[PDB]
Symmetry: D2
Subunit: 115 residues, 4 copies
């Protein structure tokens, strides 16, 4: 897949399993169109969101439902979600791994982009 | 102020200066209503966004224009911006510091919430 | 002070208070010579470690006792400590802020170096 | 392997390739004994450091030579290295992934521990 999302839990030192992830693409009218969604697996990874032909140039938003993840563990976290917004494929097709490392009052996100 | 934003640059080891920050409150119709904005100071800090009276309970979005910052430095960035979305004051008024540490392909954000 | 250390807790969204910090200078024989130490304040900050005269060029180690902090909170940690090792003042005296953001299984450290 | 190290570059959004990594184990006399070493591959991963039978309980230090990585890219970074120190296998054998995300003036490190 040209787009993979990986989510880790910095409290438990584990993959963050069953985290909902929604992907949107900015349409010509500037609205966010639903693009793909899924949940992280037991390895904290979400594969198969899209294909090379569907994943054309554009601005994409990945929204990771971090609040439901923490709430299910009993925690009332700070953030409603973790959103990552980015222009994709501007210089031709690339493969993107969007990684997120989650704590109740902090998160980090990183992209690894390969050709 | 009950809300302060602080932005750091992990490439130069410095405050991130003159970074545009916009704050929104979620409206009854789920749209984002612009509320306050500013540019970070020489210390990477943005003070005076709001007041205790005005900063009522609700869902808030802080959008940090990370792409303009990296463009100003001649460095290719990944993200269009860094967004932080949170519910405020759920258990009473708090002082919020939203800190963001920026790299071209990664950012982290942390909330320091004090009483 | 030319050297300040600031520690934040990503689980509680707070300064990390009463965290032990030890600073060492590398000796001619490659051993670590203890130099200064302290505990972070209510703001997570440790000031007054050293002075401009004393803080000459050299390699310095800051060891943050993250394991004691997490043990005090009843939370199982991964690391024995967080170490930060750096060469100081290579291009002249600077003011260094060493910031660390702590989670039980992850930490980040950043230097803010100003003139 | 029960111990894997993965290193990423937050400036370029890429694996950090050919990074030297040295692992030490604390001996009964409290000294650091060399345990294993290697370099990250094209995927920024270092596999094969040890075996399940060799990787007994103990305190381990992983030193990642982040300074040589940056210097080879023309950058004079803040840190001399990134060190991660941890007790392993205290509650029986586990598999450890030590991940490090590198910027010139910042790094983060995370452990994913699985059973
Ligand atoms: O988020 C921070 C951080 C991110 C990665 C590593 C270490 C600290 C951070 C860095 C520096 C400061 C702060 C603060 C609050 C919350 C986070 C940080 C803060 O109040 N101040 O003054 C910092 O300098
Ligand atoms: O973002 C990561 C990170 C966050 C904080 C500290 C160290 C690494 C991170 C952790 C683990 C993995 C990855 C990956 C890509 C990008 C970032 C990470 C990745 O591909 N894999 O396999 C990781 O395990």
């Amino acid at each position: 897949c040209p787009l993979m999302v990986k989510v880790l839990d910095a409290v438990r030192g584990s993959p963050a399993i069953n985290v909902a992830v929604h992907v949107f693409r900015k349409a010509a009218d500037d609205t966010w169109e639903p693009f793909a969604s899924g949940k992280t697996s037991e390895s904290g990874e979400l594969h198969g969101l899209t294909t090379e032909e569907e994943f054309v140039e554009g601005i994409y938003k990945v929204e990771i439902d971090t609040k439901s993840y923490w709430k299910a563990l009993g925690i009332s976290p700070f953030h409603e979600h973790a959103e990552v917004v980015f222009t994709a494929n501007d210089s031709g097709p690339r493969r993107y791994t969007i990684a997120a490392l989650l704590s109740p009052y902090s998160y980090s996100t990183t992209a690894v982009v390969t050709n």
